[PDB]
Amino acid sequence: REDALFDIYRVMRPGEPPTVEAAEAMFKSLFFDAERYDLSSVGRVKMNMRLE
DNA sequence: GCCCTTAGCCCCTTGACAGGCGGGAAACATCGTGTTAACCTTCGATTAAGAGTCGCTGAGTCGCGACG
């Protein structure tokens, strides 16, 4: 999982040097964080309808 | 009809202002510095639902042969 986090950090921010906790925090803030990945309720309902 | 005399116009000489660009002298609003030391020593967007092609890189497959 550390290698996957490093790869994700390099893909998103190639210039910045990926770190163990920095890469894990980047993915969380990108997708696991509701502050940035603010998917509306219409998106969630559309996902629930498309894939049950 | 021509010459003399006098009047009007044009020109010259002086001048008493009027103020008027402009540097100086001065009173006043800028423009580049400093300086202070009580706490955090990775901030953040933004394509990515069409499309013809230029410029580079790095993987899997083969020949030629040597040493048992």
Instruction: Kindly provide the residue ranges of all beta strands, DSSP E only, lying in A1-52, ordered along the sequence.
Output: none
The owner of tokens 């502050």 is A35
Q: Count the residues in chain A.
A: 52
Q: Nominal resolution in Å?
A: 3.8
A17 touches strand B (CB under 7 A): yes
Strand B lies under 7 A from the Cβ of residue A13 = yes
| Contacts for A3 with CB less than 8 Å, ≥ 6 apart | none
Query: Do residues A23 and A6 lie in contact, with contact meaning Cβ atoms separated by under 8 Å?
Result: yes
Run of H or E including A47: helix A41-50
Provide, in whole angstroms, the distance separating residue A25's CA from nucleotide B39's C1'. 26
Residue A35 three-state SS: coil
**Dist CA A15 CA A33 (whole Å):** 23
Place of tokens 């309808």: A49
Q: How was this structure determined?
A: cryo-EM
- Cβ of A11 near strand B (under 7 Å)? The reply is no
Q: How far apart are CA A26 and CA A48, in angstroms?
A: 26
Residue identified by tokens 């994700």 is: A8
